[PDB]
A paper describes a structure:
TRPM4 is widely expressed in various tissues and has important roles such as cellular depolarization, cardiac rhythm generation and immune response. TRPM4 and its closest homologue TRPM5 are monovalent cation-selective channels; they are activated by intracellular Ca2+ with a weak voltage dependence; and their activities are regulated by small molecules and lipids. Like many TRP channels, they exhibit pronounced temperature sensitivity, with activities strongly intensifying near physiological temperatures.
The E396A mutant displayed two strong phenotypes compared with the wild type: the loss of the temperature-induced potentiation and the inability to activate at negative membrane potentials. The crucial role of Glu396 in coordinating Cawarm led us to propose that these phenotypes stem from disrupted Ca2+ binding at this site. Accordingly, the Cawarm site was absent, despite a pronounced Ca2+ signal at the Ca TMD site, suggesting that the two Ca2+-binding sites are not allosterically coupled.
Residue numbers in the entry:
A (entry chain B): 782 to 835, 851 to 954
B (entry chain B): 1042 to 1090, 1115 to 1167
C (entry chain A): 7 to 25, 33 to 48, 59 to 174, 182 to 317, 328 to 386, 393 to 480, 500 to 514, 557 to 710, ...
D (entry chain B): 435 to 480, 500 to 514
Amino acid sequence: IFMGNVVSYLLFLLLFSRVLLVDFQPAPPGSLELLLYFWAFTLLCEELRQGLSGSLSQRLRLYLADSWNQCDLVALTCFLLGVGCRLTPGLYHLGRTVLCIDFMVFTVRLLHIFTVNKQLGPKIVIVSKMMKDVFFFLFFLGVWLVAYGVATEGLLRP
Amino acid sequence: MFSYTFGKVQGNSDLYWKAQRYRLIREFHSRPALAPPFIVISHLRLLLRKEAERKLLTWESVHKENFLLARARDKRESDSERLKRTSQKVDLALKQLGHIRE
Amino acid sequence: EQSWIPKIFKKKTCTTFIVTLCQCGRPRTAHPAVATVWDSDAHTTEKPTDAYGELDFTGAGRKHSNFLRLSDRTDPAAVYSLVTRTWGFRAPNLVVSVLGGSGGPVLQTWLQDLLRRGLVRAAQSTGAWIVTGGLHTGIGRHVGVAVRDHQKVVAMGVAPWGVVRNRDTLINPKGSFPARYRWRGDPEDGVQFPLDYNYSAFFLVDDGTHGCLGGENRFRLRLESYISQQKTGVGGTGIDIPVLLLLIDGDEKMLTRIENATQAQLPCLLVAGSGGAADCLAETLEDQGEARDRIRRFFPKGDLEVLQAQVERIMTRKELLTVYSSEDGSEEFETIVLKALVKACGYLDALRLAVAWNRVDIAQSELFRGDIQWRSFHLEASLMDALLNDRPEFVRLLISHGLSLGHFLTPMRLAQLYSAAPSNSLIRNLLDQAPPDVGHVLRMLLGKMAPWSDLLLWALLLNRAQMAMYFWEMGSNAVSSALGACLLLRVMARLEPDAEEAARRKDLAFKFEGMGVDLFGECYRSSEVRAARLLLRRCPLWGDATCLQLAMQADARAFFAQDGVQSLLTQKWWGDMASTTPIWALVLAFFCPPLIYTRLITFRRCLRRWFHFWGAPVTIFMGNVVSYLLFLLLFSRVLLVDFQPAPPGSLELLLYFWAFTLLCEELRQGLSGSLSQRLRLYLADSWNQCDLVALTCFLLGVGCRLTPGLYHLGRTVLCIDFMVFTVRLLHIFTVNKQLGPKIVIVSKMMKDVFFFLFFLGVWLVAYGVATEGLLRPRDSDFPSILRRVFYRPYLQIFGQIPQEDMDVALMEHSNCSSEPGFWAHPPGAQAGTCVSQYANWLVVLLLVIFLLVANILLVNLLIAMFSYTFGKVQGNSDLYWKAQRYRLIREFHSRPALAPPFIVISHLRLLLRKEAERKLLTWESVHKENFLLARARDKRESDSERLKRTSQKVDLALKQLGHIRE
Amino acid sequence: NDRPEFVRLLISHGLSLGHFLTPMRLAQLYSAAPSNSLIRNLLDQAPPDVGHVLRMLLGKM
Ligand SMILES: [Ca+2]
Ligand SMILES: [Ca+2]
């Protein structure tokens, strides 16, 4: 079941890219785009099933507590928003941009695959724990960039 | 910093992964057998809708008794416990020696 | 399996009536329709038993105290079989049938101390059974409380059915596996008693009576006799189980029971000072007789001549009777039992019995006295018993007594020893598949590609750690035997159905490897010219395979790690040249052949030196390296310059011939180094796989080149083949003491590499597709799309950031496309004719995030993972390199002395075609003895052992102090 | 009185435990909760009535 799910998700990403790069046009959606809409709807139904069966509020919170479920939910929300914007006559470009970001959100989900390997799962956990060091570096670099950039801009006087 | 953190949280991360492995397996144990593109056909199906045990417990109890006996024997044969027993026996010998001296 | 229990066991009914009240203990009213002197057998009926199962005393207990109800006239063989097999009780090495009325609930302090310290302790030590009355009264209660205080011990209780309180709750014809018994019934009358809760199993003898005493005596005596007729395990090898009766106090009934037991040839132990019916016999044995009977025994029947006649009949067989000397409470039970059994005996030996028990001190005392004079078979039988029952200490002691072992072991005895394999054990299966016929199974395990040796092999096969250890200590070829034992144990472990059994074999193999390495270290540090140069390089009787071969097959990395073996391998690597020769000296000699004869290199005489220099593995390796470098140089020269569509030139033909010679060399390596077996062995090496793929690509490229139409394809294939060939040069660093471990660690870094690659691939796909979608370049060509989606983002990781092709601020605005919106014209060739500029700040933001993640976070994470892995697998990699060093040296030891370009001339040659040893073994044995003595002394002087000895000495002093105080 | 050794020894003497424990005895045992202890508070919030507090702690989900 896991392997079939992985293969289907890879095919879904392939179709999403195919639609986004080629078949996405201001005209009304084509056959492939409608297939993508149906596929995303089935993914939404699957997430709904996972949340619903897995004390309604209790199990809903239990489902929403998982990071991967949060990622799936945000991806699907962005997809719905992008489709809505695209269908509207005036918000075509905004919809395309939202879907472009949503593709990144969907693709990041593939990292879940490595949680099954005996060696990669611990690596992903450690990576998740590296974020304090990442933030320290980012804050230090931001301070340094502000200082240096403002000093140089003031000196040059463009 | 990355090197230090990676070296520091190796064991805890491994334990955490081993723990959540059960959650992963259980999640994929209950999912529909079909893929998301076709999973609609299965969500539709979901919609519209002893003596052996006693023997097992007895065997478990036998193993528990063996484990407890092993722990007790290991503790009793430890150096600290043997030293304590020797001290008590020496004290008993000393008391009997004082008693006989009278 | 219980339905058979009712089939073979029967209970008794009141049946016929004998007078108001039945003579069968039941009221005349409560009798069946069928109801002079009532008969326990004639006036009763037998029905299937309906009170079997096990007892679960409420709360405490082992949750299992097997019970049973059976007729008195029952054959004890069935009872013994049921107890031994069905209920799981092992065969008793000794049975103590405790007797004694012990009038009055209270018992003397010394008697209670003896029971809790002499009897119960001995029973637990020897795994004996204690047979008493399964009731909470009389001596049974005292025995039970002694057992409880000592606490397990097996206490069988044979009691009548009818005097047991709450007999109703036990009745369940279907079975009573969960049985609940309330031994604490409020009424307290002598008619019935409660079953004690300290006894492991009960036998409720049924004689068709509702209360009586002595009705079970017949069955008890019959069971005692039958047990005394059995054997002490190991099939018929064991001696007859000793069954003796212990008596404390008593009465005329006890005297009759003692008489019956003596008639049954059962030793009796009479406790001195126990009381009446026991001190009477003790005094009679020690030495008016009627006066003794009157004073000691109760006044009734004292003047009766029956008592005196019974005492006379008892003394008629006084050999069986023995008095437990008070000795101020000696509490030395095992020795007294042994003395009583010896006296009764007047074959059965104290040695065999001591071996049956695990008491080696008792046998040590028995043999230490010079009074006993032993013969050959006498000790041989005991040694066989010790071997069969896995008693290493006893075999050590027996061998220590000058027992000749060469004549002891015989094909019949060896067959018996192997026959003792435990039920369905791997050794048993292998023997069945294959007299012992051990050679066939040994060859099957290894593949086939002196009593001590045989006994060591047997112990290894049966996996008896201590016995195999001892046999190795007494063996001749210590180091080779240790390595062979490690090999055999590892092979068996890999071949075992159950992992837990395999782990024991694996641990034993590890222990043998440790002993082998320690002993060889001792031998080497004593004398290097011997030991390594001779012990390792000789071919023993194991498989006529040198110890190094055994270590290689066993994967005994620890054995290769030690400095002695490494120094020997280095010495073999340099051949006859001194191991200290500098590398530069070797190079100079290689390029200046005459300089070999100069004193600057240290070792017909001329031809001898010539062949010594050019045959050493190191010089062959250097020549091979030089030839391979020249081959790569020629390959590059051909590929870059002389490769043309025209027919091959001279240099290209030379390259073809050179590659052909390399192919022939690989063929030779695979062929000579069981055709399929050696082929797989060759193909298993990674370097051989690399060579094979390189040569296959070379053949494919040459074939394509020769074909008129596939010239370019051939050139491309050869271009890749050059990379494949060049990668082989990494094999050079496997010889350096520092680089080889590095290469091993590098090979182990691939998991981290793959993690990084997968992460980077996911990130690249996401970012590239997002950027391509945002820009909307109008090329929209599949190769161009793939380029912009994968290649360009990938190159951005290495500082190749084409801002002009992504940032609209750096491009020229133009109305390229008729589609609505604003567009810009990138200057890049493959950047798309024009890109949308709707939200370009988002493209720049994605570029910023991608640079951050990829360049910094992922790369630094990979560095951290590499650092961790490198630090973690240092030692294992070093050991692995030290182990494979032998394979490298052996491979280069057998190669032709000529280089691949000329190796054809040598492949052609290949085609068309003591007392010193005994002295060496003796010296090895001396060193082994020294090493074993050192280990034993170090263990004895350790703090833990000294503390244990002090505790024992303190206990001895305490016992002597208590003794003197009296 | 929290004397594990004594309870071990007493049980070791063939004391029948099934008949020993009774609802009154269990109520007494739970009544021995020390003054204001978490168990005491939970019992007050909820005879022992232990099942309810057990479900509350576990949640009975
Ligand atoms: Ca999910
Ligand atoms: Ca090769």
